[PDB]
Design a binder for this molecule. Structure first.
Ligand SMILES: [Ba+2]
Ligand SMILES: [Zn+2]
Ligand SMILES: [Zn+2]
Ligand SMILES: [Zn+2]
Ligand SMILES: [Zn+2]
Ligand SMILES: [Zn+2]
Ligand SMILES: [Zn+2]
Ligand SMILES: [Zn+2]
Ligand SMILES: [Zn+2]
Length: 305
C-alpha cells in the first residue's frame, strides 16, 4: 500500500489492528455491481445505511443504495470476510503532535470531542491500560464502560467499543470483565489480589479476612496481602493536538498539478478521486498517488479524513 486511510480490527489471522480495505455493494442484490453517482468523502458516507446511491449494473436489479464494508488488508480475504472499521483511527498525514507524548506518530486516534483531540496509538493503549488498573473507565447505560477524550472533553465517549481491541487479547479481556467487577465493588465486595485470578468476592463488610473460594487465596482486605493474624494534559499540547488546527506547510501541498495537463488543482473535500476541471483534459486521478484513478486507491483510500 502506498497510503492507508482506513484501519480495521482483524479477528484473525491478524488478531490485531491493521490497514483495512474498503468495499461497496448494492444493498439489494449484495453484488459488486453498484456504480456510485459520487464516491464517499467521509466516514458517515460509509457508516450510515443507504446514505449513498448509485445504479446497480445487474441487467435485472433495481437497487440504487450502496452498502459499504471493510476487510483486513494485511493478506487475502474472501469476497466478504468483514472486519470492523475503527473509524476513529487515522493516518497522521499532517504530522500533528500527540496530546500526551507530543511526538509525531502514525496512525493516531482522533477523539470526537469538539476539539477533535489527537492521540497516538501507543498513548491510547497506555491510556486504556492506566484507566483499567485505576478503575477509571466511565459507565453509560446504552454502552457500558468506555473512555472519554484524554483531555476531559464532554460527549467524547468512544461508542464503537471495538476500538478497545487496541489493547491486545488480555488487556482486552480485563476490559470485558470490567462491568462485572464493578458490580461486585459497587456492593462493597472485593477482587482477589492474586495475579491472574482477580475473581469477584462478597464477604461480610466487617471481616478483615477474605478467602477466594477461585484460587484459594486468603488475604487481609485492608492491605490485599495474604492473611496476617497481626495488624497490617498540558494546555499547549491539547491546543496543538487538534485534528482541525491550523498547521505549517508539509511536503504534500494543498494545491497539486494535474498529472496530465499540469494545471494546479484545488481539492474541495474528502474524496481522493479527482476530476481535472480543465474542459480539454478531464483526467480522473488519485490526489495522493498522482495517477489515473483505479480500484486499488478506491480500496485503500477512497477518502481521507
Ligand atoms: Ba510480622
Ligand atoms: Zn488480517
Ligand atoms: Zn443490485
Ligand atoms: Zn503519544
Ligand atoms: Zn478533547
Ligand atoms: Zn482468587
Ligand atoms: Zn493486611
Ligand atoms: Zn488535467
Ligand atoms: Zn491513490
Amino acid at each position: 500500500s502506498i497510503y492507508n486511510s482506513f484501519y480495521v480490527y482483524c479477528k484473525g489471522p491478524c488478531q490485531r489492528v491493521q490497514p483495512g480495505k474498503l468495499r461497496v455493494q448494492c444493498s439489494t442484490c449484495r453484488q459488486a455491481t453498484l456504480t456510485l453517482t459520487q464516491g464517499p468523502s467521509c466516514w458517515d458516507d460509509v457508516l450510515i445505511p443507504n446514505r449513498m446511491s448509485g445504479e446497480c449494473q445487474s441487467p435485472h436489479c433495481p437497487g440504487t443504495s450502496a452498502e459499504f464494508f471493510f476487510k483486513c488488508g494485511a493478506h487475502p480475504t474472501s469476497d466478504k470476510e468483514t472486519s470492523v472499521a475503527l473509524h476513529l483511527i487515522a493516518t497522521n498525514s499532517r504530522n500533528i503532535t500527540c496530546i500526551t507524548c507530543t511526538d509525531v506518530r502514525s496512525p493516531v486516534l482522533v477523539f470526537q470531542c469538539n476539539s477533535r483531540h489527537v492521540i497516538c496509538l501507543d498513548c491510547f493503549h497506555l491510556y486504556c491500560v492506566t484507566r483499567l488498573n485505576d478503575r477509571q473507565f466511565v459507565h453509560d447505560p446504552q454502552l457500558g464502560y468506555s473512555l472519554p477524550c484524554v483531555a476531559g472533553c464532554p460527549n467524547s465517549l468512544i461508542k464503537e467499543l471495538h476500538h478497545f481491541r487496541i489493547l491486545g487479547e488480555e488487556q482486552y479481556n480485563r476490559y470485558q470483565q470490567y462491568g462485572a467487577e464493578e458490580c461486585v465493588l459497587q456492593m462493597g465486595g472485593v477482587l482477589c489480589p492474586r495475579p491472574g485470578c482477580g475473581a469477584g468476592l462478597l464477604p461480610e463488610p466487617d471481616c478483615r479476612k477474605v478467602t477466594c473460594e477461585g484460587c484459594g487465596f486468603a488475604f487481609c482486605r485492608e492491605c490485599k496481602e495474604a492473611y496476617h493474624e497481626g495488624e497490617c494534559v498540558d494546555e499547549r499540547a491539547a491546543e496543538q493536538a487538534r485534528w482541525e488546527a491550523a498547521s505549517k506547510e508539509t511536503i504534500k501541498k494543498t494545491t497539486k498539478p494535474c498529472p496530465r495537463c499540469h494545471v494546479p488543482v484545488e481539492k474541495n473535500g474528502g474524496c481522493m478521486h479527482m476530476k481535472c476541471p480543465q474542459p480539454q483534459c478531464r483526467l480522473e486521478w488519485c490526489w495522493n498517488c498522482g495517477c489515473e484513478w483505479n480500484r486499488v486507491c478506491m480500496g485503500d483510500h477512497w477518502f481521507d479524513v
